[PDB]
Amino acid sequence: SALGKLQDVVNQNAQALNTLVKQLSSNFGAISSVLNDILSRLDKVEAEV
Amino acid sequence: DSFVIRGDEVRQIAPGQTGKIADYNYKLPDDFTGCVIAWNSNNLDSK
Amino acid sequence: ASVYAWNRKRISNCVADYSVLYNSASFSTFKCYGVSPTKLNDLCFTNVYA
Numbered sequence: 001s002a003l004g005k006l007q008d009v010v011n012q013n014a015q016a017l018n019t020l021v022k023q024l025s026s027n028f029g030a031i032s033s034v035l036n037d038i039l040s041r042l043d044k045v046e047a048e049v
Numbered sequence: 050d051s052f053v054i055r056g057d058e059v060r061q062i063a064p065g066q067t068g069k070i071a072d073y074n075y076k077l078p079d080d081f082t083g084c085v086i087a088w089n090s091n092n093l094d095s096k
Numbered sequence: 097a098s099v100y101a102w103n104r105k106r107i108s109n110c111v112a113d114y115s116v117l118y119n120s121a122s123f124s125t126f127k128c129y130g131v132s133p134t135k136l137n138d139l140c141f142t143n144v145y146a
Contacts, residue, residue: 031130040139043132044079045065057121067134069119 050075053094059087107144113137 027033031041038047054062054070061071064079097103114136118126126133
């Protein structure tokens, strides 16, 4: 518990990277967040939207 | 560009389309800048 | 069938060639809502219902 500052600096960066990775799974309104679903299911004029 | 085509196929004369006219007859580029003008011509083209 | 008692067929355990459907100009509409009809022949599905 003395080294709470340094271990928090490690934790903040780990939480930031893990948040950034987990956001790859978010749809943001797309039909899927797996980019290969979109590219395999949709033809270019729909896929680009 | 100009031609006579069957009325049900006119939907294929656009960017991104598919079917026999768009695949083998005449294909627009997918970034086409232009106007597509068509009319039913059965009073003159039919024979 | 009638529209109040609409018919469902489960379609399963097969190849299906959707180009054979999409090529039929009799289909006055063929609107698809999460797949494009050109792409269907490169997919495979866990079930299909007609």
